[PDB]
Ligand binder design. Structure first.
Ligand SMILES: O=C(NCC1CC1)N1CCN(C(=O)c2ccc(Cl)c(Cl)c2)CC1
Length: 121
């Protein structure tokens, strides 16, 4: 399975599955700074799933590793901003993360395999 471009549609499909999940709702759009007025005192680089999807569709990811780094930032931001490890929003973030890690692993493996095959000779 040595298609170097296949990761892009596979990531589009996985983002569709995350957007169809209730646990994504706090992460679909940038954190509301009126709701959380100290957010940028804690978080240096905001990230959300609409920004990831727009970056993918603009053709501004070169690899699925770059998309994976941004999605992981969504989760690390939630962990850094949470006042408690028991908080609702953080709790939702950990379920999304396990689902994401479960499905992204084949996308990364297949892409890296395809690039090694391209450089085989
Ligand atoms: O659009 C969907 N299905 C399309 C299929 C043709 C029917 N979805 C998206 C969400 N689904 C998950 O698998 C899921 C489960 C747990 C978590 Cl945490 C997350 Cl993020 C996602 C199933 C329903």
């Amino acid at each position: 399975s040595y298609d170097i471009q296949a990761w892009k549609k596979q990531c589009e499909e996985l983002l569709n599955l995350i957007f169809q999940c209730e646990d994504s709702e706090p992460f679909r759009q940038p954190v509301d700074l009126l709701e959380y007025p100290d957010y940028r005192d804690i978080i240096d680089t905001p990230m959300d799933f609409a920004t990831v999807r727009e970056t993918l569709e603009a053709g501004n990811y070169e690899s699925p590793m770059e998309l994976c780094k941004d999605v992981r930032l969504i989760f690390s931001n939630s962990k850094a901003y949470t006042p408690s490890k028991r908080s609702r929003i953080y709790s939702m973030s950990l379920r999304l993360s396990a689902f994401f890690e479960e499905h992204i692993s084949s996308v990364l493996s297949d892409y890296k395999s395809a690039l090694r095959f391209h450089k085989r000779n």
